[PDB]
Write an enzyme that holds these catalytic residues in place. Structure first.
Site, PDB file in Angstrom:
ATOM      1  N   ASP A   1       0.777  -1.284   0.127  1.00 52.26           N
ATOM      2  CA  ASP A   1      -0.092   0.018  -0.011  1.00 52.26           C
ATOM      3  C   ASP A   1       0.917   1.304  -0.043  1.00 52.26           C
ATOM      4  O   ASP A   1       0.483   2.208  -0.667  1.00 52.26           O
ATOM      5  CB  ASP A   1      -0.857   0.143   0.963  1.00 52.26           C
ATOM      6  CG  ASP A   1      -2.183  -0.844   1.015  1.00 52.26           C
ATOM      7  OD1 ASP A   1      -2.370  -1.554   0.112  1.00 52.26           O
ATOM      8  OD2 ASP A   1      -2.732  -1.484   2.061  1.00 52.26           O
TER       9      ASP A   1
ATOM     10  N   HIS B   1      -5.836   2.866   3.708  1.00 54.96           N
ATOM     11  CA  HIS B   1      -5.650   1.615   3.754  1.00 54.96           C
ATOM     12  C   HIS B   1      -4.545   1.152   4.552  1.00 54.96           C
ATOM     13  O   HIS B   1      -4.509   0.209   5.437  1.00 54.96           O
ATOM     14  CB  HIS B   1      -5.567   0.922   2.554  1.00 54.96           C
ATOM     15  CG  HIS B   1      -6.689   0.956   1.703  1.00 54.96           C
ATOM     16  ND1 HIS B   1      -6.726   0.744   0.276  1.00 54.96           N
ATOM     17  CD2 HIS B   1      -8.118   1.761   1.969  1.00 54.96           C
ATOM     18  CE1 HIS B   1      -7.811   1.234  -0.293  1.00 54.96           C
ATOM     19  NE2 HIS B   1      -8.655   1.694   0.831  1.00 54.96           N
TER      20      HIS B   1
ATOM     21  N   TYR C   1      -4.174  -0.593   9.041  1.00 53.07           N
ATOM     22  CA  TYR C   1      -3.302  -1.730   9.633  1.00 53.07           C
ATOM     23  C   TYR C   1      -2.512  -1.316  10.799  1.00 53.07           C
ATOM     24  O   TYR C   1      -2.761  -1.963  11.947  1.00 53.07           O
ATOM     25  CB  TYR C   1      -2.250  -2.039   8.605  1.00 53.07           C
ATOM     26  CG  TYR C   1      -2.917  -2.936   7.442  1.00 53.07           C
ATOM     27  CD1 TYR C   1      -3.824  -3.918   7.753  1.00 53.07           C
ATOM     28  CD2 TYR C   1      -2.487  -2.568   6.306  1.00 53.07           C
ATOM     29  CE1 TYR C   1      -4.428  -4.750   6.456  1.00 53.07           C
ATOM     30  CE2 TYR C   1      -3.188  -3.047   5.072  1.00 53.07           C
ATOM     31  CZ  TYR C   1      -4.137  -4.018   5.240  1.00 53.07           C
TER      32      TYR C   1
ATOM     33  N   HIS D   1     -10.414   0.255  -8.109  1.00 60.07           N
ATOM     34  CA  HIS D   1      -9.150   0.808  -8.370  1.00 60.07           C
ATOM     35  C   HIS D   1      -8.487  -0.234  -9.465  1.00 60.07           C
ATOM     36  O   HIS D   1      -8.063   0.025 -10.505  1.00 60.07           O
ATOM     37  CB  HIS D   1      -8.091   0.807  -7.126  1.00 60.07           C
ATOM     38  CG  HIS D   1      -8.324   1.773  -6.172  1.00 60.07           C
ATOM     39  ND1 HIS D   1      -7.456   1.922  -5.222  1.00 60.07           N
ATOM     40  CD2 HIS D   1      -9.464   2.529  -5.775  1.00 60.07           C
ATOM     41  CE1 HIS D   1      -8.054   3.104  -4.346  1.00 60.07           C
ATOM     42  NE2 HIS D   1      -9.243   3.378  -4.601  1.00 60.07           N
TER      43      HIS D   1
END
Ligand SMILES: [Ca+2]
Ligand SMILES: [Ca+2]
Ligand SMILES: [Ca+2]
Lengths: 312, 302
Positions: free
Chosen positions: B82, B116, B120, B210
């Protein structure tokens, strides 16, 4: 120790591949200011379709065609500047970041300046005719004085001097759009287009942070340089600002002279030129005479953004 | 038409300065699909703080420290991918856009993939110790098999071929992260970490769009090429995917070492490899056997 023997992906992509890549670490943060800024801008997320622009139709309709043309043209010029910052300016900052979180913050900035450009579109959709919208785009493309301003700043984004790019980045939200922002605040001070000025205050709530943040990062980087190099960068900032003021004055006279607003708009602009310098760590040379804003206009400028228009 | 005698700023900055710049026009748009995608991704805005991850504590405490280490490692591996996409991949797409709106959509994409990666961190802050977090970062840096995957794709973002850059940009959301995504869905299918799986579902709601959108834009550009150059690009895609599947298998066998999840995770990965190819306009060569996902795991996709 992992952090000191690894690089972020963007450093690996563009600058140095001697070490492996590290994932972003949001649990141990290098600069607390980044978390503060991240939280503020994400919590301030908004979209233009939540503001009732249709309630401006009565006051819009009392303005003559010349005033309506001026507003459409001015806003389309501001749209151009946001398009520059969204698609080039802010994204160019990502690879020159001091910290990992800064890389994500500039991604947010690029997106949100996109939303700012989107919001002018929603205003035009509600208030303007198809012919007014098209005329303004034609006018922006053919206005050399307008075009000169982003043309001066863009080369700094595509070149390899990070500090000059950062200055150019901060010069957009910190200075260049204020000559245009004078108009909606002039108008709302006389009870005209109140709901439009709510969109402008939401845009400004973001741009004020964008300017502060780039100025903050600029000061951190230049503080590490030699006194000679610091003096060189100070000279560049004032030289560039002097150039940009010259171009801005020419554009604003062309935009506002027929309505008698150019001298007020230029003083409104120079006030924010002083604030731009202050946010970069420098003193403002501009006098109170040169930066005088009328109380009614400054009230519209400094009014707080309405949190009922937030996404959550 | 002002549009046909001007360029967007990004075109001016990197390609052609012969004509003056035009501001984005949201009142007359070239491709209606851009408006649909813009609306969907902006309306789907979310932040990780609005999921109650603290309610996973009981089921986190049911898992031994080997399982906890695996989860932290897997997710920190996904965080790297990411980070690559937010800071390099998606922003690299802006200057190669077919339309004005696409330039702004890729800015949203880079921001949201940032969110995103941030989510985490929220999960780690909620459940993991500082030492669990640090160990996972060490492990990511020193894992050559993990590192090989982004290292293979990054060159396409920094190189001068827009189509190869686009393919690489689609391959990360469309394929690479699914090997890791197998883990939380395997776990929530057994009632472990249900709130974490809600974050994973919010991430996927973005990533699927995406992958679709990048695949859609790839197809429009390649359709304009000659049949020979189209064939050359198809060959590049299947060859690159073959290499990336090879690297993913090696990584997943290492990652899931001791847990026996690698064969299932690889099948789960190859299912999404087929969907990746479909989003690019090609046909999936993978068998039903090769892409088999257990019903309980597939149920967690929804
Ligand atoms: Ca006057
Ligand atoms: Ca904690
Ligand atoms: Ca197995």
């Amino acid at each position: 120790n992992y952090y000191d023997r690894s690089v972020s992906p963007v450093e690996y992509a563009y600058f140095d591949q001697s070490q492996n890549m590290r994932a972003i670490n949001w649990n141990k943060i290098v600069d607390e200011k980044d978390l503060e800024v991240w939280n503020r801008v994400t919590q301030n997320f908004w979209l233009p379709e939540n503001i009732p622009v249709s309630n401006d139709l009565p006051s819009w309709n009392e303005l003559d065609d010349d005033w309506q043309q001026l507003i459409t043209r001015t806003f389309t010029g501001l749209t151009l500047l946001d398009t520059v910052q969204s698609s080039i300016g802010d994204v160019a900052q990502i690879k020159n970041s001091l910290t990992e979180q800064e890389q994500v913050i500039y991604a947010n900035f690029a997106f949100m300046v996109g939303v700012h450009a989107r919001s002018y579109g929603t205003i035009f959709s509600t208030l303007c005719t198809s012919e007014q919208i098209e005329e303004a785009h034609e006018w922006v493309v053919d206005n050399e004085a307008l075009q000169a301003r982003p043309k001066a700043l863009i080369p700094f984004y595509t070149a390899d001097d990070p500090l000059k790019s950062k200055i150019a980045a901060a010069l957009m939200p910190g200075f260049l759009l204020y000559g245009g922002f004078y108009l909606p605040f002039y108008l709302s001070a006389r009870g005209k287009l109140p709901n439009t000025s709510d969109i402008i205050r939401l845009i400004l709530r973001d741009k004020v942070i964008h300017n502060f943040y780039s100025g903050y990062k600029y000061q951190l980087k230049v503080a590490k340089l030699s006194p000679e190099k610091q003096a060189e960068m100070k000279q560049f900032v004032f030289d560039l600002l002097d150039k940009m003021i010259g171009l801005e004055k020419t554009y604003l006279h062309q935009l506002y002279d027929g309505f008698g607003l150019a001298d007020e708009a230029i003083r409104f602009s120079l006030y924010n030129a002083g604030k731009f310098l202050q946010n970069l760590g420098y003193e403002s040379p501009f006098t109170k005479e040169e930066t005088r804003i009328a109380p009614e206009v400054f009230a519209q400028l400094s009014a707080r953004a309405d949190e009922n228009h937030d996404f959550f």
